[PDB]
Paper text:
As in the human co-crystal structure, m7GpppC is bound near the C-terminus on the positively charged swath of both orthologs where the Watson-Crick faces of both the m7G and the +1C are recognized through specific hydrogen bonds. We previously showed that, like human DM15, fruit fly DM15 directly binds 5’ TOP mRNAs in vitro and in vivo. As compared to human DM15, fruit fly DM15 loses one net hydrogen bond between α4-α6, although the interface between α2-α4 gains a hydrogen bond. Strikingly, the N-terminal α1 in fruit fly DM15 unfolds at ~1.5 μs; the residues assigned to α1 are very dynamic after this time point. By the end of the production simulation, α1 had not refolded. There are two differences in this region in the fruit fly DM15 as compared to the vertebrate DM15 sequences: fruit fly has an alanine in position 801 (all numbering as in S1 Fig, based on human isoform 2 [NP_056130.2] for simplicity), although it is a glutamic acid in the other two organisms, and the α1-α2 loop of fruit fly DM15 has an asparagine substituted for glycine at position 807. A glutamic acid in human and zebrafish DM15, residue 801 forms a salt-bridge with K804 during portions of the human and zebrafish DM15 simulations; E801 in human and zebrafish DM15 also hydrogen bonds with the backbone of N796 during portions of the simulations. These interactions may contribute to the stability of α1 in human and zebrafish DM15 and are not possible in fruity fly DM15 because residue 801 is an alanine. N807 interacted with the backbone of both A801 and E805 during portions of the simulation, which would not be possible with G807 in the human and zebrafish structure. These interactions may contribute to the unfolding of fruit fly α1 by facilitating the stabilization of alternative states that culminate in the unfolding event.
La-related protein 1 (LARP1) has been uncovered as the mTORC1 RBP target that regulates the translation of TOP mRNAs through direct interaction. Among other target transcripts, LARP1 specifically binds TOP (terminal oligopyrimidine) mRNAs encoding all 80 ribosomal proteins in a TOR-dependent manner through its C-terminal region containing the DM15 module. To assess whether this uniquely repurposed fold is evolutionarily conserved, we crystallized and determined the structures of both fruit fly and zebrafish DM15 regions in the presence of a dinucleotide analog, m7GpppC, both to 2.3 Å resolution. Indeed, both orthologs adopt a structure similar to that of human DM15 with three tandem, helix-turn-helix repeats flanked by an additional short parallel N-terminal helix and an orthogonal C-terminal helix.
Numbering used by the authors: 796 to 925, 929 to 946
Write the structure that this text describes.
């Protein structure tokens, strides 16, 4: 199996294995450029699912930073995986710092003219079974009410 799947198997994550896998992913990105590495893409998906229960400040900051570099040049997959992590990760374990970040990246995504992040935020607030919202995102969400 591919490391992106084997490292998600229950109780099988190892540091030694993640380091080898992580390594070639960055080399492949550093070799082929933003949004051009299918191997790097497997790492975005691994991060998206892994951190939902398997959180790591180290991995999360990297995930976020690279996803935003890519998306700043038009390649959306990494950022799409990050919003999916935000929406489903916070449903499984609410972290206030990560909720604030979710707001921050949703606002930034909307103001670049996208709706993928805002819908994911709307989806979270709706299903999150239990929130204060930056009044700017508050108004953006009110206008989204005409869509979903």
């Amino acid at each position: 199996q591919h490391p992106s799947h084997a490292l998600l198997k229950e109780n099988n994550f190892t540091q030694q294995a993640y380091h080898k896998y992580h390594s070639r992913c960055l080399k492949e990105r550093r070799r082929l450029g933003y949004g051009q590495s299918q191997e790097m893409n497997t790492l975005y998906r691994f991060w998206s699912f892994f951190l939902r229960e398997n959180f790591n400040k180290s991995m999360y900051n990297e995930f976020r930073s690279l996803a935003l570099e890519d998306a700043g040049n038009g390649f959306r997959y990494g950022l799409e995986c990050l919003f999916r992590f935000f929406s489903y990760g916070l449903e499984k374990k609410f972290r206030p710092n990560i909720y604030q970040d979710f707001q921050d990246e949703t606002i930034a995504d909307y103001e670049t003219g996208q709706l993928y992040g805002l819908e994911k935020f709307w989806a979270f607030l709706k299903y999150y079974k239990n929130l204060e919202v930056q009044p700017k995102l508050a108004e953006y969400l009110k206008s989204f009410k005409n869509i979903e």
